[PDB]
Amino acid sequence: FSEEQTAEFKEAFQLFDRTGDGKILYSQCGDVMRALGQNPTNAEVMKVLGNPKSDEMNLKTLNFEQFLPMMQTIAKNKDQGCFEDYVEGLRVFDKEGNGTVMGAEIRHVLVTLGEKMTEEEVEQLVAGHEDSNGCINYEELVRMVLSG
Amino acid sequence: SQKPLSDDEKFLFVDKNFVNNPLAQADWSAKKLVHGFEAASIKE
Amino acid sequence: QLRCNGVLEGIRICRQGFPNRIVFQEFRQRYEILAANAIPKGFMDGKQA
User: Fold this and answer.
1) Under 8 Å CB-to-CB from A8, ≥6 apart: which residues?
2) Which of A44, B12, C6, C14 is most buried, judged by most C-beta within 10 A?
């Protein structure tokens, strides 16, 4: 992964810095490599970093020299699942395939499938992307979470 | 007929997971569940 | 007793025939996600979907 957006990577790297030493927490540099044009789960957000433990994740910060390995290991995702597979799979998931999924059931399979997101995570996902119906439209939902 | 509530049709009832939806690796696994028979999602 | 009624055999025989039958719209639900890709579930064409 090219060494020219190393500048952008250092930028956003220091963007979610807290120690303030050119060295950024691994969960923090992970949300960094997220908002660098990627969409990784906090799980892979951590694992891409040479697998830092939760201590290393938020205590041993990342020296930017090893953030160049991290930008490599995050640039594998760069985004998440296909939106046609999104729609067909959340249609077949939804018990009818109508076009939306219960905010109940969508927040469910967002906290009951894959990495169990914080319900604030599946909400800032779902809320802010809700249709006020309770069957939160995963189409609008997934897509504005995809762009945002 | 399918009446668990009526023992007049409970033996006639059909007790089973009714999901019939394209999601059953949310109540089960791809691993194939199963005389002396052991409902065994195929683990290895 | 199924074998004794041939019902184990009758089950094998449904198998010896067409044992199951995935309904068209059942197939559409089940297999929009499974390789339809231009055919969303609840699609229009019973056969062609």
Assistant:
1) A36
2) A44
Please choose, from the candidates A39, A38, A70, the residue with its C-alpha nearest in 3D space to the C-alpha of residue A57. A70
Radius of gyration of chain A (CA): 17
Q: Are A34 and A79 in contact (CB under 8 A)?
A: no
Choose the mutation target among C3, C8, C21, C30 for the interface with B, i.e. most B CBs under 10 Å. C30
d(CA A90, CA A135): 12
Whether A98 has its CB under 8 Å from any CB of chain B: the answer is no
Helices (H) and strands (E) in chain A, counts: 9, 2
Please report, in angstroms and rounded to a whole number, the separation of the first and last CA atoms in chain A. 23
Q: Is C43 on the interface with A (CB under 8 A)?
A: no
- Give B32's contacts (C-beta < 8 A, 6+ positions apart): B40, B41, B42
List the structure tokens of A126.
């779902």
A122 CA: distance to closest CA in chain C (Å): 23
**Which chain A residues are Cβ-neighbours of B23 within 8 angstroms?**
92-93
**A87 touches C at CB < 8 Å:** yes
Resolution at which this structure was determined, Å: 19.0
Across the strands, what pairs with A23?
A: A63
